[PDB]
Amino acid sequence: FTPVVLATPIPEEVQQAQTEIKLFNKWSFEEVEVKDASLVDYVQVRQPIFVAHTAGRYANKRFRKAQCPIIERLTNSLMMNGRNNGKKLKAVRIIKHTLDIINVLTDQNPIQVVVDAITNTGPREDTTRVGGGGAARRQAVDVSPLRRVNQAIALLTIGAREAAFRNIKTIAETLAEELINAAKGSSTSYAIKKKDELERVAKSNR
Amino acid sequence: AQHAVILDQEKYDRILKEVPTYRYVSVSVLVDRLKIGGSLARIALRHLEKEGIIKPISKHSKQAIYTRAT
Amino acid sequence: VLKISTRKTPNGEGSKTWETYEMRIHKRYIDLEAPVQIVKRITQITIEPGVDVEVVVASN
Amino acid sequence: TPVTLAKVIKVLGRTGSRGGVTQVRVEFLEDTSRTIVRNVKGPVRENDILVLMESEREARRLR
Amino acid sequence: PGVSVRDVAAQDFINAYASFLQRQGKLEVPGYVDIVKTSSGNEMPPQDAEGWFYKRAASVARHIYMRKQVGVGKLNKLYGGAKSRGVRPYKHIDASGSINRKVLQALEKIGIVEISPKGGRRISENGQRDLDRIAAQTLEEDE
Amino acid sequence: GRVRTKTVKRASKALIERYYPKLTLDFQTNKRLCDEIATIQSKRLRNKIAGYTTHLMKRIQKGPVRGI
Amino acid sequence: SLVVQEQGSFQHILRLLNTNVDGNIKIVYALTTIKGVGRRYSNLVCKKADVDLHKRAGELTQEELERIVQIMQNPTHYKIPAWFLNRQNDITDGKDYHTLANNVESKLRDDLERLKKIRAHRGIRHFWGLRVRGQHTKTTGRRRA
Amino acid sequence: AVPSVQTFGKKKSATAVAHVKAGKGLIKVNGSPITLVEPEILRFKVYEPLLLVGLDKFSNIDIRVRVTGGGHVSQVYAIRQAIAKGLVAYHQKYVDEQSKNELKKAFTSYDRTLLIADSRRPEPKKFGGKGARSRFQKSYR
Amino acid sequence: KWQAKMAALSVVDRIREDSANDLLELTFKDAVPVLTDVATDFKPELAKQGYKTLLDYVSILDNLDLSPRYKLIVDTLQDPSKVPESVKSLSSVTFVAEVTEPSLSLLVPILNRSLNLSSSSQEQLRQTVIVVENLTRLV
Amino acid sequence: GTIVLYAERVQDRGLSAVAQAESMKFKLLNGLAIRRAAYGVVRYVMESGAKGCEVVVSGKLRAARAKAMKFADGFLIHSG
RNA sequence: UUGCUGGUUAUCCACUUCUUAGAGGGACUAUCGGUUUCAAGCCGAUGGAAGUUUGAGGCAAUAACAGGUCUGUGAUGCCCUUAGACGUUCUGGGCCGCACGCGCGCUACACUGACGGAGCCAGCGAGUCUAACCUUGGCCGAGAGGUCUUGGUAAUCUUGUGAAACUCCGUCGUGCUGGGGAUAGAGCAUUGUAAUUAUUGCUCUUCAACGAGGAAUUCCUAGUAAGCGCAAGUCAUCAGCUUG
């Protein structure tokens, strides 16, 4: 593809990818596209990135959070339960291995699996605790799509956290089976369970 | 201690016969088949890449990833 | 910057409010090559209330 | 399972006691010119597309 | 080309030079190897007991290659990690000084490191020679 | 909130009331006129008074402003 | 590393120093169920006895176990220096012992009576069952009785 | 004297000074090539100048970056800012204005603060809490 | 440099080809450890040629007692992972011939390795001490 | 011989807080009534071309309970 | 084959980008659009190092509280005592005493981990004149520490404080387990006139509850919460505290 040799030799795989197409850890960003209407403009494939780390100021405005690339936003939600606050390099390792496991099981480009897991796990209807006379009757409401992406990322990663806790599976594998089983949503995953519980409670209280 | 550790004779044939057909294979999967502790799963993961059976796609310790050979 | 942090209160009652006093101290140094008369002239002169001058010789 | 899409055309304000619900006017994507008023749960703005799981219940105010 | 030890990744070089020091044999290991803890902020002896002194010796030879000089105490500050003080919070604790000083004397005995002026210990000519030579060999191995 | 106090507004008003030529519509030149013809004891207050004079120039030049 | 064939010489729970040891765990940490030997002592003993540490404790041919017992209860003879021992400079011999399994509690009880007969404050405090090392006892230690 | 510039890049307390001169195409960090930048996840974070813009334009120039301050992560953002700003300063002073515009346009079209320093600095903490915003836990009897 | 050391190894093989063995046994005694240091060089080509030079150079030694042993012995002089293996095989040799300078000079680096190593077992330390005692009382 | 004391009459000696405060204190120790003494201080400071003066006297004054009286004139700032 | 990586408080020359600190500049919500009693303003984009009052503070009104402090004061009224003292000093103890209840915290319940090598990166500080402070370097010791010198009244030396979490390679493999390190025993050192009611540090041994915490309840909106250590205050020694 015409590699260039310069005095500090950059390896041919680094030039191979990174000069022409600005693909991921190594996975493409032309294809995958979102398979749901809106949840476009709130899942931010293309802009592509090279690593899922960025010191990005997405917090100081009301909707700049949607410009975070969806892999980095899922990466950011991994570093919690207290002891793991901070530690984003661990989180990039977990995402990197999760994407590679997802390429092994169901060959199928892993950013498609991740984006389809976001579209298939965000609750389309939820519930709010209105007063209604003290013993607060709960009323059903619709949801905004940024809230759907928010809740989908929290449901996925909290399912992986609860699943990887105290068993021989690492967290890249529980993220892998959670993202796979939520992708073509199999309702054995934690996230599809929680999503349909939220929708059946809001269906009961509409 | 829950029938998961040592080296036993039938498990060598069970590793050489059933680690093929495994799409994704790692430490945790060689544990998770009601079988080996993680220590001999790591030993057998290095041994099944020594010849034949598995391709490593991803290297780094605390997450082994291996795939079926072709 | 010399900082001294102390409680505001002489007793221990009240919400714990703290107070960071500080004294700034600025230094300079000028290397000259002067004859000993002109040394004496510039060393006695430039007295100021609140400036400290220290003059040394022999740059070895 | 009847899904529906609807574009937010005019956000009307905030309702609910604690204030997290949004009064939204939505115009349907498929078979348009029919606008309704829904209560959404999260952060919404105009030119979104809501997913309406049941399409005919026009909400007005929450306490 | 011309290869310094700076042109090699650190763990690759330290494995190559530590395996070389292992194999070749000019050792002077202290004898209290495999009884010693390498720190007071540690819990166990080093898990690579047949070895690990060549590991520390190789890392110290790379560490004096990259600086003007280091004494014993900077190696004790470097190789000492955090100590779990029981139920009290953790703290930085320096490593074992006899380990690092006998590393420095064991390297000084084989001509790698010489006691410099301005204190400390320096890399010498027959240290730079050998370290750049095996750095070129380590980069050669991956051809 | 960028509401400007009565110091900025009354000094800006008084600067336009006696210097309407000299006081164009550009901030960077009114910034120098408030340095020349007024004595303002700070740089930040100078920039604020100069910005409000430029603002009142911008709305004088499309018809009158009540007061000035 | 490498897989080994290993016919049925492996044994589960094995009796030494008058107690049981789980054969299904690695030797250095399987010997610590014996009282009086911990992680460091067992590590050094299993080094001095020329034992491969990558062995499970059930593998362990009886020459290795006999060496382990012999070094464990004669430790100054096998150059475990003096300071690696929990009964140095005793109070009757002035030699250094290493109290092993069903002896170590005995020596602790012996130690206690040697205070308690002498009526020193640490002994009187041990016999009341209160805190001994000068801890505050107002707020802590409330379910130990 | 070769046509050479010097630039710098910063993050929270990390600074990295680059010397960019004419040469054969070596990129060095502290003496060591840029393929040795480890934490090793953020390696492709520091490659991003060298291939947002083509791996040529580094063919004829030599970059040496020296880093100081910060930690293992903020230093990588410092040195990628150093490489990027140094390349656009070398193109400003010696090549021409238009090619400098094309590099700056490519970097700004990506912009992980590649040209502009990250303006965030740590907040001073206050009394009554372990942080800047946080407080100590109170009891209300 | 390694090419100059390859040249020196080639001319050492030239001298070992040329001169007679009984004259060469003094230089055997002198030249075992330096060829050990060359066969333990990190550069693998220099290591292979320093191994081959040592192999031929011990193969000129006229000893029927250590004649099948040689291939292992320089192998033990190559890597000290074989020093636990080498003493147990060095015990099983019927030492009927007098052990002068080269027959002992080919042996005693192996014994020094089994002495100084921390990797060596107390069985191997005992065997090596027994060997050096009977080898001092064998001459 | 290495330390030289120099007197100096201070100038515009009403515009110092220390001079007026120890003046007020002596006039009170001698036994002036409190309002009179404080108004003498405040008027002598405003005569000296001040911009303002505050004289605050706390304590018990012929009653058992402590009070305070703020005798002021002119304009004083408080913050900055 | 030009080359690459280093060393040399002066072998010289030049420079001030990085560092320092004097004097200045810079942002005023500038420009544009929307909206608005087309006022004050508000909302979005562009440009910008900076567009929440740019971020954080310091100062902070009137009137009060029977708020707290007579144990900060040679601030202080009135009462009490003043030689068998309520003054002052010395010796020993106590403020640590333990069926229990409450508040601030530290360490944990593990594999997003523990341990073992290896990588290796800060910022605010503070430091010895009638003295023994911060301590590099060399030897001794498993360690804590010891000993001989050296540098520094400090942008100079300690100190690039080579800090910790973290990163890589491994051992462990889900087991109150190698998570956890309480409790208790023996030994070696340091500070001190004096260490027992264990000052503290180190080594070996002992190996407790704790499997994510009920009712309740705290703090928090961006370099912020949280994790992580470092310096200073106190200090002969001792930080699980506070200030940064």
Swiss-Prot record, chain C:
Location, primary (coarse class): cytoplasm
GO MF assignments: mRNA binding; structural constituent of ribosome
Modifications made to the protein after synthesis: N-terminally acetylated by acetyltransferase NatA. Also partially acetylated by NatC.
Compartments (UniProt record): Cytoplasm
First and last residues shown, out of full length: 62 to 121 of 121
Organism this protein belongs to: Saccharomyces cerevisiae (strain ATCC 204508 / S288c) (Baker's yeast)
Function: Component of the ribosome, a large ribonucleoprotein complex responsible for the synthesis of proteins in the cell. The small ribosomal subunit (SSU) binds messenger RNAs (mRNAs) and translates the encoded message by selecting cognate aminoacyl-transfer RNA (tRNA) molecules. The large subunit (LSU) contains the ribosomal catalytic site termed the peptidyl transferase center (PTC), which catalyzes the formation of peptide bonds, thereby polymerizing the amino acids delivered by tRNAs into a polypeptide chain.
UniProt family annotation: Belongs to the universal ribosomal protein uS10 family.
Subunit structure: Component of the small ribosomal subunit (SSU). Mature yeast ribosomes consist of a small (40S) and a large (60S) subunit. The 40S small subunit contains 1 molecule of ribosomal RNA (18S rRNA) and 33 different proteins (encoded by 57 genes). The large 60S subunit contains 3 rRNA molecules (25S, 5.8S and 5S rRNA) and 46 different proteins (encoded by 81 genes).
One Gene Ontology term from the biological process aspect of the record: cytoplasmic translation
An annotated GO cellular component: cytosolic small ribosomal subunit
Crosslink (Glycyl lysine isopeptide (Lys-Gly) (interchain with G-Cter in ubiquitin)) position: 40
Swiss-Prot record, chain E:
Disruption phenotype: Disruption of a single RPS19 gene reduces cell growth; a double disruption is lethal. Depletion experiments show the proteins are required for correct maturation of precursor rRNA to generate the 18S small rRNA. A specific site between the 18S and 5.8S precursors (site A2 in ETS1) is not cleaved in disruption mutants. Partially assembled ribosomes are retained in the nucleolus rather than being exported to the cytoplasm. All effects are exacerbated in the double disruption. Increases association of NOC4 with 20S/21S pre-rRNA, decreases association of ENP1, TSR1 and RIO2 with 20S/21S pre-rRNA.
Domain of life assignment: Eukaryota
GO biological process: ribosomal small subunit assembly; ribosomal small subunit biogenesis; ribosomal subunit export from nucleus; translation
One MF term in the entry's GO annotations: structural constituent of ribosome
SUPFAM superfamilies given in the database record: Winged helix' DNA-binding domain (SSF46785)
InterPro entries linked: Ribosomal_eS19 (IPR001266), Ribosomal_eS19_CS (IPR018277), WH-like_DNA-bd_sf (IPR036388), WH_DNA-bd_sf (IPR036390)
Keyword annotations: Cytoplasm, Ribonucleoprotein, Ribosomal protein, Ribosome biogenesis
Positions of disulphide bridges: none
Outcome of swapping residue 101 to E: Decreases mature 18S rRNA, protein binds 20S pre-RNA complex poorly. Lethal in double RPS19A/RPS19B mutant
Effect of residue 56 to E/Q: Loss of mature 18S rRNA, protein doesn't bind 20S pre-RNA complex. Lethal in double RPS19A/RPS19B mutant
Keyword Calcium: no
Designated name of the protein: Small ribosomal subunit protein eS19A
Gene field: RPS19A
UniProtKB/Swiss-Prot annotation, chain I:
Source domain of life: Eukaryota
Coiled coil: none
Protein location: Cytoplasm; Nucleus
Function of the molecule: May be involved in the mRNA export process. Forms the [NU+] prion and induces [PSI+] prion formation.
Domain notes: The N-terminal 153 residues are responsible for the prion properties of NEW1.
Family: Belongs to the ABC transporter superfamily. ABCF family. EF3 subfamily.
Name of protein: [NU+] prion formation protein 1
Species name: Saccharomyces cerevisiae (strain ATCC 204508 / S288c)
Curated annotation (Swiss-Prot), chain J:
Disulfide-linked positions: none
Cross-link (Glycyl lysine isopeptide (Lys-Gly) (interchain with G-Cter in ubiquitin)): 25, 51, 60, 70
Modified residues (Omega-N-methylarginine): 65
Modified residues (Phosphoserine): 16, 48
Outcome after substituting residue 27 to E: Impaired ability to rescue stalled ribosomes
Compartment(s) of residence: Cytoplasm
Misc remark: Present with 146000 molecules/cell in log phase SD medium.
Subunit structure: Component of the small ribosomal subunit (SSU). Mature yeast ribosomes consist of a small (40S) and a large (60S) subunit. The 40S small subunit contains 1 molecule of ribosomal RNA (18S rRNA) and 33 different proteins (encoded by 57 genes). The large 60S subunit contains 3 rRNA molecules (25S, 5.8S and 5S rRNA) and 46 different proteins (encoded by 81 genes).
Sequence similarity: Belongs to the universal ribosomal protein uS3 family.
Known role: Component of the ribosome, a large ribonucleoprotein complex responsible for the synthesis of proteins in the cell. The small ribosomal subunit (SSU) binds messenger RNAs (mRNAs) and translates the encoded message by selecting cognate aminoacyl-transfer RNA (tRNA) molecules. The large subunit (LSU) contains the ribosomal catalytic site termed the peptidyl transferase center (PTC), which catalyzes the formation of peptide bonds, thereby polymerizing the amino acids delivered by tRNAs into a polypeptide chain.
Protein name (database record): Small ribosomal subunit protein uS3
Organism for this UniProt entry: Saccharomyces cerevisiae (strain ATCC 204508 / S288c)
Gene behind this protein: RPS3
Full-protein positions shown: 82 to 161 of 240
